[PDB]
Amino acid sequence: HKSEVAHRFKDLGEENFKALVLIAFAQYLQQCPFEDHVKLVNEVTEFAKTCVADESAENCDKSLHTLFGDKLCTVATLRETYGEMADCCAKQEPERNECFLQHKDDNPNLPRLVRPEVDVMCTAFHDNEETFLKKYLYEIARRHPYFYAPELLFFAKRYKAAFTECCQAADKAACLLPKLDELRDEGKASSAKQRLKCASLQKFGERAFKAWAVARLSQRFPKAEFAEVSKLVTDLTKVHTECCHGDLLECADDRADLAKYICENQDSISSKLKECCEKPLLEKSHCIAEVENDEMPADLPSLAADFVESKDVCKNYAEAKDVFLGMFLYEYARRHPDYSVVLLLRLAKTYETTLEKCCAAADPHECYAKVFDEFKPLVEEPQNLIKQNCELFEQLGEYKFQNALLVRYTKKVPQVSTPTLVEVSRNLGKVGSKCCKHPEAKRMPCAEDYLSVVLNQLCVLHEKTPVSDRVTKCCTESLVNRRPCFSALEVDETYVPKEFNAETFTFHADICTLSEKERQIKKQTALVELVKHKPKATKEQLKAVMDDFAAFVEKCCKADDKETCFAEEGK
Ligand SMILES: O=C(O)CCCc1ccccc1
């Protein structure tokens, strides 16, 4: 509009405005205290209200990137707390905003969020409800600087709903802790899922993201025509382009417009949207993003009639390559909800390479006649992977499957730091607990598309301080071949065994007071250090060392030896 901050304030309302601005500052300035961010948000909100009253007021005609960029450099502790980040304010937009994105720390070096007792949180929630929810938006945004901002507003609504219901219950802990544990897990998954959308945009461009969007939406909305799916992909690409670039006010506004358009044209998109569209606005967008795949229309013609057996295959492809390739991806994705997105991208990439060399010959039809037969090896390749990994997971359980994959990937890339290897390998085991129960119909889009997210975690956490060129090679190769690049890696022989440090294998009584999950990570951290020292150690001897450590921990926690049990286990 005329005043951009007034257009977003009037579309989103003050509540969502204040919350999104808070996320914005917390994602860029991740080290500043909570009190300093509230003043900026309130100063932005007071300034925004003056523009709603008069759009032609002072400073109201500036762009959102300019207004947000200027207020960022007003903090006196910018260069003393963030270092060289202040040097980037000497640039105009958008050259200034692009640097601020580079300084977002994916591992921001922040203490773990200790959760107070249930009676303490409930008293604080009743004292100041607005401040209590602001600290939740603040603490999550810092540790997740790319978190899907409109989706974070929804998590805050459920976080508020969990306390409103449970703090009046007779047994508050039995009510609240299950909801909080589920909210944290679903929030970590949402963070990692969105971190791949931004990496795909910031490292491979919109074309690679629109192809991903076309595939998944065609599996999800098979009844919709191509022009309808393309319209949704165009609107969805602009949303995540803004969210990943920090334009959180435009992202949540455009997402609400997109959610509203789908519901007013559901009969042209999908039949699974009747219930999702009867929810409040913030819940409406979340429901649509997780709706089931609609039933594809019955009696569909084969792709060979329009893409292999036609006198205008090369004619329509030459007239518009990406449009013709986008129709092939759409027609194939809608018919195959059992394929993963990344697989459909490989089949489209293969179909593209064939049309580039065959359409230049004199007999194109005889050249690309058997193009679909080249897809058989690509389809069976991830099925052998999932089948072998799920059989290994069903015979060990999640924890032993995590350790099995923890030793496997430590031997592949031993240079990666231990905290990064532990988190990634633990998440590589959670995909087994989530997908290996589905039948072979819905198992591939579950497993392989979640491996895309987890391996992206390895890429971003290694992108900061690279220590291994093997991860860099698989991360910057072609995005869609990331998993095959890692699944084909062998044990790194050029890695020299690390030095021996006894302080790493020394513990205290603090390990007994930790939770069972925190104890597993404490032990798995010691397992990664064991594999680095002896890369050629057999898996059975690695079990003999882990069986002694798993027994030594239980021995010292039961026996009240005043942690002298841990000190005596020195050698
Ligand atoms: O083999 C690898 O490289 C990692 C396999 C990870 C995986 C887990 C569960 C299902 C499928 C795959």
Curated annotation (Swiss-Prot):
Subcellular location as annotated: Secreted
Transmembrane regions listed in the UniProt entry: none
Disulfide bonds: C51-C60, C73-C89, C88-C99, C122-C167, C166-C175, C198-C244, C243-C251, C263-C277, C276-C287, C314-C359, C358-C367, C390-C436, C435-C446, C459-C475, C474-C485, C512-C557, C556-C565
UniProt site positions, description: Aspirin-acetylated lysine: K197
Binding site for Cu cation: H1
SMART domains, A to Z: ALBUMIN
A biological-process GO annotation: cellular response to calcium ion starvation
Residue ranges constituting the Albumin domain according to the UniProt record: 1-184, 185-377, 378-571
Sites where the protein binds Ca(2+) 2: D11, D253, D257
Modified residues (Phosphothreonine): T81, T418, T420
Residues annotated to bind Zn(2+): H65, H245, D247
Tissue: Plasma.
Keywords of this entry: Calcium, Cleavage on pair of basic residues, Copper, Disease variant, Disulfide bond, Glycation, Glycoprotein, Lipid-binding, Metal-binding, Methylation, Phosphoprotein, Repeat, Secreted, Signal, Zinc
Effect of D373N: In Nagasaki-2
Known outcome of mutating K311N: In Canterbury/New Guinea/Tagliacozzo/Cuneo/Cooperstown
GO MF annotation list: antioxidant activity; copper ion binding; DNA binding; enterobactin binding; exogenous protein binding; fatty acid binding; identical protein binding; protein-folding chaperone binding
Binding positions ((4Z,15Z)-bilirubin IXalpha): K238
One term under GO cellular component: endoplasmic reticulum
Record-linked Gene3D superfamilies: 1.10.246.10
One Pfam family named in its UniProt record: Serum_albumin
Protein residues bound to Ca(2+) 1: E4, E242, D247, E250
Post-translational modification N6-methyllysine, affected residues: K532
Record text on subunit structure and interactions: Interacts with FCGRT; this interaction regulates ALB homeostasis. Interacts with TASOR. In plasma, occurs in a covalently-linked complex with chromophore-bound alpha-1-microglobulin with molar ratio 1:2 and 1:1; this interaction does not prevent fatty acid binding to ALB.
Function statement: Binds water, Ca(2+), Na(+), K(+), fatty acids, hormones, bilirubin and drugs. Its main function is the regulation of the colloidal osmotic pressure of blood. Major zinc transporter in plasma, typically binds about 80% of all plasma zinc. Major calcium and magnesium transporter in plasma, binds approximately 45% of circulating calcium and magnesium in plasma. Potentially has more than two calcium-binding sites and might additionally bind calcium in a non-specific manner.
Family: Belongs to the ALB/AFP/VDB family.
Stated name of the protein: Albumin
